[PDB]
């Protein structure tokens, strides 16, 4: 029904805590609360437990990641660089 046109998730904070502040909070929480999928099964049901904890209900294989993203961009490039470094080592 589109109750709130722009505040998005940050409707619980009411009319407080600023505008830009509430906007970064909005972006952080809609990254946080999105439903994710297990890289081992593919079902979009991975949820979040505590900080840095990504726990699913179907695959049942919790994988640690970022506090707000399963694998941040820094994690992705780190994984790629170890991939290539070991590939060079064992080449």
């Amino acid at each position: 029904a589109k109750r709130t046109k722009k505040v998005g998730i940050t409707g619980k904070y009411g009319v407080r805590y600023g505008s830009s502040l509430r906007r970064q909070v909005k972006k952080l929480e809609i990254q946080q609360h999105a439903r994710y999928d297990c890289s081992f099964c593919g079902k979009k049901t991975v949820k979040r437990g505590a900080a840095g904890i990504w726990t699913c209900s179907c695959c049942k294989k919790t994988v640690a990641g970022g506090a707000y993203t399963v694998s941040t961009a820094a994690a992705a490039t780190v994984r790629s660089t170890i991939r290539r470094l070991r590939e060079m080592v064992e080449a």
Binding site: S39, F40, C41, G42
Partner: protein, 96 residues
């Protein structure tokens, strides 16, 4: 590519999808080729390969996941293991 050959054998030849169908068809040994996704657990691939070796049937892996395989077989749902028992108008047994 591979996907068009699977589509062709789906429309022309018979097909079995899922766990129970493929393990049964392996048991009676009516299958010819089996398709297994990469995202599946390793024990899945190991036992499927063991059954295929017992039934001297060939094994082909695909570099993808479950939802990928469901899309590739031309179906709106998802599939993890695909086994064919009769090609018909296709020639996947000849090549690959």
């Amino acid at each position: 590519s591979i996907n068009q050959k699977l589509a062709l054998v789906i429309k022309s030849g018979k097909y079995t999808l899922g766990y129970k169908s493929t393990v049964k068809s392996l048991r009676q040994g009516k299958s010819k080729l089996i398709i297994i996704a990469a995202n599946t657990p390793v024990l899945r691939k190991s036992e499927l390969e063991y059954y295929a070796m017992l039934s001297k049937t060939k094994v082909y892996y695909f570099q993808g996941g479950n939802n990928e395989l469901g899309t590739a077989v031309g179906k709106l749902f998802r599939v993890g293991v695909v086994s064919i028992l009769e090609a018909g108008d296709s020639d996947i047994l000849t090549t690959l």
